[PDB]
Amino acid sequence: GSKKKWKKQRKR
Amino acid sequence: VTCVGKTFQIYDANTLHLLFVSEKETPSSIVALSAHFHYVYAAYENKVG
């Protein structure tokens, strides 16, 4: 995952 | 045999290594080149060398 705390990112 | 301005150069086809170059620069640029065995005929202005 993005893991900025997970950054708001769409799953494709 | 390839023309280079007022002089010509000879390359070996197998290796493209220089073999001979014209001893002197022609008074005029060469227009045509003909090679026949050990002789090459060069044309410039009204003289064929």
């Binding site: 708001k8 769409r10 799953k11 494709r12 | -």
Partner: protein, 121 residues
């Protein structure tokens, strides 16, 4: 689509989809019919959401039966695309579940939406 009952109205769909989008961010959302089924088996679901337009609708008609037996709230939305949209996935979701968490930061409106769904049923 007479089978899907009760079907939330346009306004009611708003708050539900809003909570679903929130629950997605806080990892309190379970997406998919079987994954929704597992929550009901484990009794960890606040309530179950389904999509009315899904064809065949029978693919989700089991969840009402589980929900009624377990006394879990349930409700239907018109569009499955919009459901998967709020879930935060690139594919349509025909059903999803909100996991039970009394320590969550989004608890209050879940109960509020739950209380309305109680009224709808």
């Amino acid at each position: 689509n007479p089978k899907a009952f009760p079907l939330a109205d346009a306004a009611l769909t708003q708050q539900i989809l809003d909570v679903v989008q929130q629950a997605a961010n806080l990892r309190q959302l379970k997406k998919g019919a079987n994954e929704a089924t597992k929550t009901l088996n484990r009794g960890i679901s606040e309530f179950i959401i389904m999509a009315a337009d899904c064809e065949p609708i029978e693919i989700l008609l089991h969840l009402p039966l589980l929900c009624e037996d377990k006394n879990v709230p349930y409700v239907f939305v018109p569009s499955r695309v919009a459901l998967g949209r709020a879930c935060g996935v690139s594919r349509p979701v025909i059903a999803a579940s909100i996991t039970t968490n009394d320590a969550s930061a989004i608890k209050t409106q879940i109960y509020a939406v739950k209380d309305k769904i109680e009224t709808l049923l």
